[PDB]
Amino acid sequence: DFTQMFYNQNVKQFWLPEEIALNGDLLTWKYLGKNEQDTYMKVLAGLTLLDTEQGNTGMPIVAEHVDGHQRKAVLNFMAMMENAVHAKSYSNIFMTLAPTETINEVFEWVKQNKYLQKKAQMIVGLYKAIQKDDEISLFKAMVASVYLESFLFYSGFYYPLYFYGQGKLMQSGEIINLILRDEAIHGVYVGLLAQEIYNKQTEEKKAELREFAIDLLNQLYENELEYTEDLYDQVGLSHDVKKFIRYNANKALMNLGFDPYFEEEDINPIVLNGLKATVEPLKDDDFYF
Amino acid sequence: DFTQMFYNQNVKQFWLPEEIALNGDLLTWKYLGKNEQDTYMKVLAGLTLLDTEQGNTGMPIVAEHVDGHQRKAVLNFMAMMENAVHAKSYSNIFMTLAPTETINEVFEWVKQNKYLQKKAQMIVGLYKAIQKDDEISLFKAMVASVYLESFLFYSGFYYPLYFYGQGKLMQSGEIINLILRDEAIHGVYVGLLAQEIYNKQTEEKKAELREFAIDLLNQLYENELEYTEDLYDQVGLSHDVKKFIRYNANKALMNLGFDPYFEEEDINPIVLNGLKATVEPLKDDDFYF
Amino acid sequence: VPKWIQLNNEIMIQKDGKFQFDKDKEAVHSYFVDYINQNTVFFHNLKEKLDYLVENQYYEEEFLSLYSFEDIKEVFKTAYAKKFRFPSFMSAFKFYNDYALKTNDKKKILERYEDRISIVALFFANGDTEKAKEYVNLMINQEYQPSTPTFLNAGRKRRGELVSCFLLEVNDSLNDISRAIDISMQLSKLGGGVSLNLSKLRAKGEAIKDVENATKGVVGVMKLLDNAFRYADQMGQRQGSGAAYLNIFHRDINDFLDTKKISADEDVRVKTLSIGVVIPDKFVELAREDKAAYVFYPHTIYKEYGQHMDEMDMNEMYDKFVDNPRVKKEKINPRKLLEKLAMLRSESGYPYIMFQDNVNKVHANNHISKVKFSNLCSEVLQASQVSSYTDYDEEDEIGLDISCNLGSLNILNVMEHKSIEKTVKLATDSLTHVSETTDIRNAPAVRRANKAMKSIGLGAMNLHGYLAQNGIAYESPEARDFANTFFMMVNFYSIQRSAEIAKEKGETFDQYEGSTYATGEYFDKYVSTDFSPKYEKIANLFEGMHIPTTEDWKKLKAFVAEHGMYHSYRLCIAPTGSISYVQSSTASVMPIMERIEERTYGNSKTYYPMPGLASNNWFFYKEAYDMDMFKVVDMIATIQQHIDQGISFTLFLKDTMTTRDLNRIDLYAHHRGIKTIYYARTK
Amino acid sequence: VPKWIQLNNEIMIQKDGKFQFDKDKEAVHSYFVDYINQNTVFFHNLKEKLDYLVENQYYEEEFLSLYSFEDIKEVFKTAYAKKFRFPSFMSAFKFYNDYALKTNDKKKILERYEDRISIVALFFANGDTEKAKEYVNLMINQEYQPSTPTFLNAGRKRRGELVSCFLLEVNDSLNDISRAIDISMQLSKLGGGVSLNLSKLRAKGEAIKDVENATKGVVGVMKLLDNAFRYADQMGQRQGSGAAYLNIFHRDINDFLDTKKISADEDVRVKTLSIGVVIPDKFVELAREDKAAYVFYPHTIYKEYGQHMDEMDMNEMYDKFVDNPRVKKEKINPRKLLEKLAMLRSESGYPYIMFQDNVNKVHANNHISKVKFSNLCSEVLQASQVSSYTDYDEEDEIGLDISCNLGSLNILNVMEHKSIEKTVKLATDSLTHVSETTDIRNAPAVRRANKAMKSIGLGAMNLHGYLAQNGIAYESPEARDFANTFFMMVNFYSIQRSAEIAKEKGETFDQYEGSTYATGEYFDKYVSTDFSPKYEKIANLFEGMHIPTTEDWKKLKAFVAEHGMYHSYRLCIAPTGSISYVQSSTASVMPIMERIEERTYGNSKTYYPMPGLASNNWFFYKEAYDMDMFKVVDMIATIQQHIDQGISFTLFLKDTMTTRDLNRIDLYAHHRGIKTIYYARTK
Numbered sequence A, B: 001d002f003t004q005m006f007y008n009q010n011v012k013q014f015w016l017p018e019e020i021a022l023n024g025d026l027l028t029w030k031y032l033g034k035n036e037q038d039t040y041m042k043v044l045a046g047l048t049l050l051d052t053e054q055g056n057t058g059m060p061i062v063a064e065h066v067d068g069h070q071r072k073a074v075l076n077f078m079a080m081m082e083n084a085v086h087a088k089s090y091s092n093i094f095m096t097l098a099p100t101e102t103i104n105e106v107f108e109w110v111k112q113n114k115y116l117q118k119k120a121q122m123i124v125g126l127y128k129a130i131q132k133d134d135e136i137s138l139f140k141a142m143v144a145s146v147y148l149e150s151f152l153f154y155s156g157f158y159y160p161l162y163f164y165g166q167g168k169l170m171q172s173g174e175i176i177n178l179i180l181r182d183e184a185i186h187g188v189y190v191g192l193l194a195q196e197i198y199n200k201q202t203e204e205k206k207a208e209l210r211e212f213a214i215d216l217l218n219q220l221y222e223n224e225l226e227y228t229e230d231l232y233d234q235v236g237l238s239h240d241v242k243k244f245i246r247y248n249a250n251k252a253l254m255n256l257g258f259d260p261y262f263e264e265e266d267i268n269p270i271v272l273n274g275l276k277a278t279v280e281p282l283k284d285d286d287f288y289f
Numbered sequence C, D: 001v002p003k004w005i006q007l008n009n010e011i012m013i014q015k016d017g018k019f020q021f022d023k024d025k026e027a028v029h030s031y032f033v034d035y036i037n038q039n040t041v042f043f044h045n046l047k048e049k050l051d052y053l054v055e056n057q058y059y060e061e062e063f064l065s066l067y068s069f070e071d072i073k074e075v076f077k078t079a080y081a082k083k084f085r086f087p088s089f090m091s092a093f094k095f096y097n098d099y100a101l102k103t104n105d106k107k108k109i110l111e112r113y114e115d116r117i118s119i120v121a122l123f124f125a126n127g128d129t130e131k132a133k134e135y136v137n138l139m140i141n142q143e144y145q146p147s148t149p150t151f152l153n154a155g156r157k158r159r160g161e162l163v164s165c166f167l168l169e170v171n172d173s174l175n176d177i178s179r180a181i182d183i184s185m186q187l188s189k190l191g192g193g194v195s196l197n198l199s200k201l202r203a204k205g206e207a208i209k210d211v212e213n214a215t216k217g218v219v220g221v222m223k224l225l226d227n228a229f230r231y232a233d234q235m236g237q238r239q240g241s242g243a244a245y246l247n248i249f250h251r252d253i254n255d256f257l258d259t260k261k262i263s264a265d266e267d268v269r270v271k272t273l274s275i276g277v278v279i280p281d282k283f284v285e286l287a288r289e290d291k292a293a294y295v296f297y298p299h300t301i302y303k304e305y306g307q308h309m310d311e312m313d314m315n316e317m318y319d320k321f322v323d324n325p326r327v328k329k330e331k332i333n334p335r336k337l338l339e340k341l342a343m344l345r346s347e348s349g350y351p352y353i354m355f356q357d358n359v360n361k362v363h364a365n366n367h368i369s370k371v372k373f374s375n376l377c378s379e380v381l382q383a384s385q386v387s388s389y390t391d392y393d394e395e396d397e398i399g400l401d402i403s404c405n406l407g408s409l410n411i412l413n414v415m416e417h418k419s420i421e422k423t424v425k426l427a428t429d430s431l432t433h434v435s436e437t438t439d440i441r442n443a444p445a446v447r448r449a450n451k452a453m454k455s456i457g458l459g460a461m462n463l464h465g466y467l468a469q470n471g472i473a474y475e476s477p478e479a480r481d482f483a484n485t486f487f488m489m490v491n492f493y494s495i496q497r498s499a500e501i502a503k504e505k506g507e508t509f510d511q512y513e514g515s516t517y518a519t520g521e522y523f524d525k526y527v528s529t530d531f532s533p534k535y536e537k538i539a540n541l542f543e544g545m546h547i548p549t550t551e552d553w554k555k556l557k558a559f560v561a562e563h564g565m566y567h568s569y570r571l572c573i574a575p576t577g578s579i580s581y582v583q584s585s586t587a588s589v590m591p592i593m594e595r596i597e598e599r600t601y602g603n604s605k606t607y608y609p610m611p612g613l614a615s616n617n618w619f620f621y622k623e624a625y626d627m628d629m630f631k632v633v634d635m636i637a638t639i640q641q642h643i644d645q646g647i648s649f650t651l652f653l654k655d656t657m658t659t660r661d662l663n664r665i666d667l668y669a670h671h672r673g674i675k676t677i678y679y680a681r682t683k
């Protein structure tokens, strides 16, 4: 009911890194404090590292196990965007803002970071556990994918959106906004594929899959809180970032056809500024009473 | 030495079939004989099948086994083109020219056609035989992919080109030329990767790999002859198409770093005839003359 | 979180397995002892308050100048003597958020409930202190509720218009289409919902002066109207709401419906304009017999006969249209069109369904015009004459564009006070005043129809609340008996008040002499059939009140024949969406959607129980979705037999049922005499 | 493939390394031997033809009844005595596919070129057989070409209006916006391109009746206008074309511009509404000095000063607006805005650029009004007064809405016949007749301004063709010398004819006494500067024709002082899209885009070489994209110094040049006195 519509929306959102000139960001970058520059670098590396997993494994593995030519094509398109567009865009932002030696050091740090690694390996673990012709293991991986696309990226997206909403780092913020817009549709699409599997299950199996999804969300959420304090306490933003994580967790759940887990909260206004019934024929004698 | 330039070439060649309006072919299509329309539909259906498998299976699997994020980005982009752009374009052509029943019938015809099933069996079999960290199985699949890109498509491409060259079906022909332009660079790129693996081998191993490549080519060739006769005898063109596929077989061998295997022949000259802005800021001197 | 918010959320925290409904009351107290009393603006006396509201352009000084300050003080004292208390938190919250007058910066509350009621009563009375006190007693007892436009805007300087709904007839011309767009923008600027009849517009592929296949059909006009309503959106406060009505025999009826399909392209999809379909009995007959029907090109029919397709009876002219070679038509499957209607209503709740023959078989003003379309809420069903808007520097032929003033009786409060007659007469007087003081300077047909028809709409609310609080199931025959008797009483006293106003003013509505009121036909079923309750429980419910008999109806018929009627239309049952909260009443005569509704305001969530919900009447407050739609249709038809205009009848459907069930409900509604169907809300 | 199409495609086939241009001539013969004569309806005599055309509602009876049949036959004989032959296949194809009258079934040809020319001449003369013969000799010599509306529709009963350029002023009110939408629809129905000034409309976030943040801005009005123009599309024949002009100091200017960005959403982008930006000298000064500029809220300025922002001189008002606290404004970077304009023009060719002070420093009717905006083709520059369209049953204040009358001189044919004076005067008379016979009953301000101003636009075309066939490069100083002399003579004879018409009829245009014509200021540069050619080649080109000197200009100034001037505006150079094909001429005064243009009609390809193109003049027919845009600007300014209105000036850019080059061309155009810039076509 939905793949051709998503095909259309995906291909019409096509873009390339070269379209946004990045050099003019240096005019606001130079005015940020060391903690702001440090947080930005670390967040950026976090997003880069997670998105690489999605391009090399997450999207291609789902495309491999999903049946249907049109779905495979949409999934291929999404994998292309990760590897050919998003990855080059993150690299471009880095090369503009930091010298080569600084980039290498930030990636060394973030590569060793406990909270980034915990979430990266949790997601990758579920992708590696998919078994041929087993729709349960595929569903679990799709849940992981939706959580990455619609939830885990957002502790990171917060900061570029925060600057973007203030008039700072506008060129890289525009790039991030385009990336985020792609991840949003990726999350919604994979969510619909997961719901298709979920709806084929018994009531007991459904309850079991719900417990899986909530348990996974809880593990990731508790690590996100630690990840958040680790990066954002030094710039005083953690309270507001936490509200943004929960709001996006609720969107991820809704993508999977589940109820929101967290109470509704308002979001930081600067970040906001940055951001069929069954047809049954009439059988006659329905006109007589 | 080459991936970056292929990356740039592939992304700059990006297109969608919807860019080309097809209603202009309606009259030249209406005017073709029933035999001509039948061959044309079947030819494009055979192409659709090849691109379906190249996009779903061939390109993603080669991407999985080739090392390097940039090489993977090129291969992922090529995969997307196969199933999200090329395979879909044929449906755009079908939906314009043919009624639904004729479309349904031709897709049923691909499923039961023995030559098309044999060529798919052979090519996809080699893709699925790739073993992780086994460069020889990978080479064999890359040879198969080059043969699909640079040889097997051409029994199909002949007919749209033959019409384009006579000023007939020129909108459909424009789509086909764009597809052909893509496959030519895909065949070269995969050819270069295959040569990398071949060049690592002992002389004895190389001799075996040439045997594999030539045996495979001959086996595919013999099947393609029967396929060509089956499609083209009713339009009187089988001998001409055979010359064309031999011509392109030599190009496939050359893409693999091998000498031509078939003698040169005169190809139908009709078929040969078938072949944001940059921004600068305003200086204070631009306001005075 | 606020204290009252916590107290209101304490309702759902069950104690001993039962909901804590009484906690709701506590919430209101908190909401007043912590927010309303602190945020209210108090003056030394009423004189300073009135002066501050007058000079600061909050109140119109003209309506207050008709009373001496002693009389205004007496009216306000009468309002405050009742010591009215909101029984639920949501009632007070809705009043003080949507209807209480606030300052320019909206930081403080200038109007209490008693202040608003006093101002509305003083506006209604037009200089009569005793009448103002009567209105104050009627509204503070919550027996009668003026519509949201009237209640919110009466006596205010920054007010809009007091009329809720406007109905426009669009003639088949570019000048008329442009004038309709202009009038729609003007009336949406005034805040009213605008309904436009597009059945006279020629279909797609018609000729504009001998060049054929030139018209864009009703879909182009629909897009123009959609953009007009988007632009005129009450200064960005409330989204501009419009309705388009098309006859089912129009050739564009499919394209019309395709405007609401969820797969529609952007060049066809219309999103801010509601759609309604007018179905004559001929279409239902064709669908019943499975005979292929024909949709018609309006311009060919107009050329051949000189009249519009919707201007004449399809039941007698359909065969002539089909057999006429000079009339252009397209073959359709009426059953497939019905299934498309059901599918569209399942997907989006559209279109509105107007059974034209059901409306016009009891329409009292067919001589003026037949009812060809309804309003945005599909409850206004009045005669309309299309206007001929000519070229510039040419005189326009101004027709009649429907417009009526809404007001709802609170059935529970009216029957508790045993004051059906007094409440109906006072509400009729208030609606007559609202019509008289309404003057729209940019809608000429609306102004002329308001001046001539003098049509008003007197609705009713809290039918389900009264039935559930009295131990009567909404689907029970006893409930239908109560509705029959109560609405016969309402119709009797509305006709009596209309005739009394006509006698006291010496004038009737325009073309009353040709109406069924003048000929006495309207009273036929009232002078031969007795509408007294057939059940002892309902008769006891009506004790202390004189139920009119056939003799009283005969006397009223003679009185109308002698004096006439001031109002062409008197009763129309609007949905009464948000003002039902303030009155602590269930919405309209519809059954409740849910027993306790969870609504999110700001970052907080609130629970509103249905008025009077408790343990003993939990199952009498049956949810509408759990109810048999056939018995709801029976109730609505029973009420409709006493209502001259229509009733906003929302269908409440379950997800399990199919489009065939929706079609069966629609056909049973048509069979039972239902005039209009509002919405198909699926749970 | 038809024989004439093969003969036309044989042009590209090179023989001896040269294009077979002469083969095109053969194609024409084939196109007449095989197709045109076979499908041309022939009659026994002209009387039968005229009777058949009049009776079958092809022609109008009124204009033919002014002549005896002998006079009409003599006019037709004069037309046919020339034995005119189309020199290229595309000329005849364009005439017989676009302008030749065809039967209702569109399979037969009723009008030849001589028949259409005779009918247009008889319509022009209005009963004078000798004047009709003069018009026939003018049009069959192809010296003058009436615009596509006039040429196509003159003398035809089934026709649109003869004017297709309309400029509307929109006042800041909902009534005025709705009236503007209606008038735009009515004028698009007539077949005209409508330009609307949106600068008087208040920006987004302004107050409506003292409620804040209520206005949707000019973008909502643009959406409404775009829907209106999509709806009114010439009865489904051509896409409805409209233009919107906004002052660059209007605050919505960015959102305005954002309507043309590709990334714009569906609720922001307008697709069938062209946009133009009016740039006062103050904006250019602010960008030049890099000082940050301010975009103002128009309604605050109107409230503070009682006049609209676009109604006063921004050069003297900008500092007062900035220093006024009661005027609301937003900070912008003018250089960033210029770069945005250049980028948008690179992407889509929008917006049109109007240099307000360049227009108004030579505007002769600044007393009536300053030119605030241009037309859809950005060449009509006239004084306009906004209208106050009030509510219903209230008298409107009708202003002046521009609608000028188009007609183009063929510079090659005019100069080879040595008939600048006669052609200019006859074209002025024909334009006056068409302006007098235009009566639009749905556009009150357009009709009032047509009656009062009597403004006509006399354009020129085949400038590049004439220069190339005479061995003159378009960018050469000799070409600019020729343009200066030729257009000074055109202006001289246009002014002389206007004064002669004023003397004959005894009336001038309304408010002529305040114009610079009456005060003699207009003739200042003409009574002091001699515009005779400075090059011997150009003087030899003008041999046989009297070139007006300073004494002749002094005599003309005295004549205008004594007798007045009938037309407020006389000369405007329109793009001349399809009539340039029929006349075998290059379009407007623009340089040619391609030497040979390839077109696709149906499923066939066709080739049109530029008129007179050969091996000898192949180099002189330089393509516009290869030319230096500074020299094109110089030529257009040289012409503009003799044109009272503007010139449709399209920029021709290569894909290599950036937005800095586009901005440099725009700033050099502003420096050189260019009034309007039409399009930025990128190769």
Ligand SMILES: Nc1ncnc2c1ncn2[C@@H]1O[C@H](COP(=O)(O)OP(=O)(O)OP(=O)(O)O)[C@@H](O)[C@H]1O
Pocket (backbone or CB within 6 Å): C028, C029, C032, C033, C037, C084, C085, C086, C087, C092
């Ligand atoms: N439910 C309610 N509805 C309306 N007004 C209320 C409500 N609850 C409190 N108020 C307002 O807040 C005031 C608080 O007084 P409260 O009701 O607690 O009793 P009180 O002080 O004994 O006096 P009284 O009840 O006689 O007004 C009330 O006088 C009234 O103005």
Ligand SMILES: Nc1ncnc2c1ncn2[C@@H]1O[C@H](COP(=O)(O)OP(=O)(O)OP(=O)(O)O)[C@@H](O)[C@H]1O
Pocket (backbone or CB within 6 Å): D028, D029, D032, D033, D037, D084, D085, D086, D087, D092
């Ligand atoms: N290039 C052309 N442009 C316009 N009309 C043409 C052209 N060529 C032919 N015709 C039309 O076809 C007719 C035949 O012209 P042709 O060249 O055969 O010789 P002719 O001496 O001009 O003929 P006729 O006896 O018709 O005057 C012309 O009279 C004219 O109506």
Ligand SMILES: Cc1cn([C@H]2C[C@H](O)[C@@H](COP(=O)(O)OP(=O)(O)OP(=O)(O)O)O2)c(=O)[nH]c1=O
Pocket (backbone or CB within 6 Å): C171, C172, C173, C174, C175, C177, C201, C202, C207, C208, C209, C210, C214, C215, C216, C217, C220, D189, D231, D232, D233, D234, D235, D236
């Ligand atoms: C002008 C115009 C009209 N119409 C349709 C809508 C109107 O309902 C219908 C009538 O237009 P009219 O304004 O009545 O046009 P007309 O009076 O000149 O033609 P006629 O004499 O036949 O009445 O034409 C379009 O669809 N598109 C258009 O652009």
Ligand SMILES: [Mg+2]
Pocket (backbone or CB within 6 Å): C172, C173, C174
């Ligand atoms: Mg008409």
Ligand SMILES: [Mg+2]
Pocket (backbone or CB within 6 Å): D172, D173, D174
């Ligand atoms: Mg105003």
Ligand SMILES: [Mn+2]
Pocket (backbone or CB within 6 Å): A051, A054, A081, A082, A086, A179, A183
């Ligand atoms: Mn990504």
Ligand SMILES: [Mn+2]
Pocket (backbone or CB within 6 Å): A054, A082, A149, A182, A183, A186
């Ligand atoms: Mn993604």
Ligand SMILES: [Mn+2]
Pocket (backbone or CB within 6 Å): B051, B054, B081, B082, B086, B087, B179, B182, B183
């Ligand atoms: Mn391919």
Ligand SMILES: [Mn+2]
Pocket (backbone or CB within 6 Å): B054, B078, B082, B149, B182, B183, B186, B187
């Ligand atoms: Mn390929």
